[PDB]
Design an enzyme around this catalytic site. Structure first.
Site, short mmCIF file in Angstrom:
data_model
loop_
_atom_site.label_atom_id
_atom_site.label_comp_id
_atom_site.label_asym_id
_atom_site.label_seq_id
_atom_site.Cartn_x
_atom_site.Cartn_y
_atom_site.Cartn_z
N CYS A 73 45.09 38.12 36.16
CA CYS A 73 44.27 38.55 35.03
C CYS A 73 43.22 39.58 35.44
O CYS A 73 42.80 40.39 34.60
CB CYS A 73 43.63 37.34 34.34
SG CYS A 73 42.46 36.35 35.34
N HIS A 123 38.32 33.75 35.03
CA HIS A 123 39.35 34.40 34.24
C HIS A 123 38.81 35.71 33.67
O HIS A 123 37.66 35.77 33.23
CB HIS A 123 39.83 33.46 33.13
CG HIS A 123 40.95 34.01 32.30
ND1 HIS A 123 42.11 34.51 32.85
CD2 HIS A 123 41.09 34.13 30.96
CE1 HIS A 123 42.92 34.92 31.88
NE2 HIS A 123 42.32 34.69 30.72
#
Ligand code: CA
Ligand code: CA
Ligand code: CA
Ligand code: NA
Ligand code: NA
Ligand code: ZN
Lengths: 78, 339
Positions: free
Chosen positions: B22, B293
């Site tokens: 990510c 994230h």
């Protein structure tokens, strides 16, 4: 043509090298080996510029990276 | 018939997570929604400019696979794609991104796209100079021309700026002025943490004279030693697209936290050094045990609306959501005129 550059070891020690812009990266790693005893296969050389952090690779010259008189290279063990 | 293959609006295309990738997807979404860059690739302007022999390049493979990914994301045939072919090339030429920091991947892609598209096919070796008492305009122009003699690319055109660097040796008091290119800015945040800071204050911190740390000394030619000089930066020339990295990971590593200051950054009309900028994309970082994230907000060039990209998922967004503590890298595009 001869000029002085510096290598900063992981300890923080500054090595002084005598080089020419036409010297290869392999030859620079050899000169570092001569002085620090680190084998070239274990050397990672980084040229930190304001616009790039380039890893120096075998087969190129100091000139390819526009390394300057009294530039500093960072040496990382890897 | 095919997961991810759905007729969609061009650019409204997610990216599958390949296992802690990510950080890469978030960076790609910001670059994908940098309109001068995406338009350059979709119009095949890059084909003529690929540089296959550049000794600092990646044999053109970073630009080629980036272009192919961008063409997929903007084809209109996908709601998400799996960027395996791109990720393979990144790992091949930058193995530090295998098995990360969104900003460091961005720095690598800006560097690799630049060299893969560098118009200078035989670079001269150039001895760079300091001001030596010459006026700032003269030295800056010389520095930019020296930069262009070795570095001339769509990446230079879009992302590269100049600052003035003033270094002062603490021992001999020698002053050394250079004009130095950059392709993004890392802005410090106030320490100790404040709950709220305007982006302009972090820019002010960036241009504040600071003594170099003992871990990053600068060679003084007069003293013939490395010294803890002070360094003062002034933003001299700003690029059409300014990438602004908020230095949130300012804590010593044992704290295992980040500066969660609410940095208030403009959606519209960030004014800097006589230039006016508008936000086009934000890389977000959410804290988490395994490095957290990354996601992204970006404005679509074809409808002018904001969207949220979370790996493979794309959703509508509003600009009122975008200023949050999660904001980590900001992409600003210079306004053509003002007033
Ligand atoms: Ca735009
Ligand atoms: Ca405006
Ligand atoms: Ca707004
Ligand atoms: Na030798
Ligand atoms: Na340092
Ligand atoms: Zn000095």
């Amino acid at each position: 043509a001869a000029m002085q550059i510096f290598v900063k070891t992981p300890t923080g020690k500054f090595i002084s090298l005598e080089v020419e812009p036409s010297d290869t990266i392999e030859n620079v790693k050899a000169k570092i080996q001569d002085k620090e005893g680190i084998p070239p296969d274990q050397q990672r050389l980084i040229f930190r510029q304001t616009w790039a952090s380039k890893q120096l690779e075998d087969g190129r010259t100091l000139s390819d990276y526009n390394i300057q008189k009294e530039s500093t290279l960072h040496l990382v063990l890897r | 018939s095919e997961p991810g293959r759905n007729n969609e609006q061009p650019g409204l295309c997610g990216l599958s997570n390949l296992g802690n990738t990510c950080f890469m997807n978030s960076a790609i979404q910001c670059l994908s929604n940098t309109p001068p860059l995406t338009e350059y690739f979709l119009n095949d302007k890059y084909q003529e400019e690929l540089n296959f022999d550049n000794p600092l390049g990646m044999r053109g493979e970073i630009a080629k696979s980036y272009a192919e990914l961008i063409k997929q994301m903007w084809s209109g045939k996908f709601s998400y794609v799996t960027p395996r072919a791109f990720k393979t090339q990144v790992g091949r030429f930058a193995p530090q991104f295998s098995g990360q920091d969104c900003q460091e991947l961005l720095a690598f892609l800006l560097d690799g796209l630049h060299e893969d598209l560098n118009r200078i096919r035989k670079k001269p070796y150039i001895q760079l100079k300091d001001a030596d008492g010459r006026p700032d305009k003269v030295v800056a122009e010389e520095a930019w021309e020296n930069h262009l003699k070795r570095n001339d690319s769509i990446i230079v055109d879009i992302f590269h700026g100049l600052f003035k660097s003033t270094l002062v040796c603490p021992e001999c008091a020698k002053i050394s002025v250079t004009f130095d290119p950059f392709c993004y800015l890392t802005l410090p945040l106030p320490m100790p943490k404040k709950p709220f800071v305007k982006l302009k204050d972090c820019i002010e911190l960036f241009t504040t004279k600071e003594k170099l740390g003992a871990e990053d000394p600068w060679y003084c030619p007069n003293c013939k030693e490395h010294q803890q000089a002070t360094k003062k930066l002034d933003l001299w020339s700003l690029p059409p697209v300014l990438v602004v990295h908020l230095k949130r990971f300012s804590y010593s590593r044992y704290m295992r936290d980040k500066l969660d200051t609410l940095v208030d950054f403009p959606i519209n009309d960030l004014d800097m050094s006589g230039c006016r900028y508008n936000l086009i994309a934000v890389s977000n970082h959410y804290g988490g045990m395994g490095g957290g994230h990354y996601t992204a907000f970006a404005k679509n060039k074809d409808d002018g609306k904001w969207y949220y990209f979370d790996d493979s998922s794309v959703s509508t967004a509003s600009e009122d959501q975008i200023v949050s503590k999660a904001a980590y890298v900001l992409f600003y595009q210079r306004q053509d005129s003002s007033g």
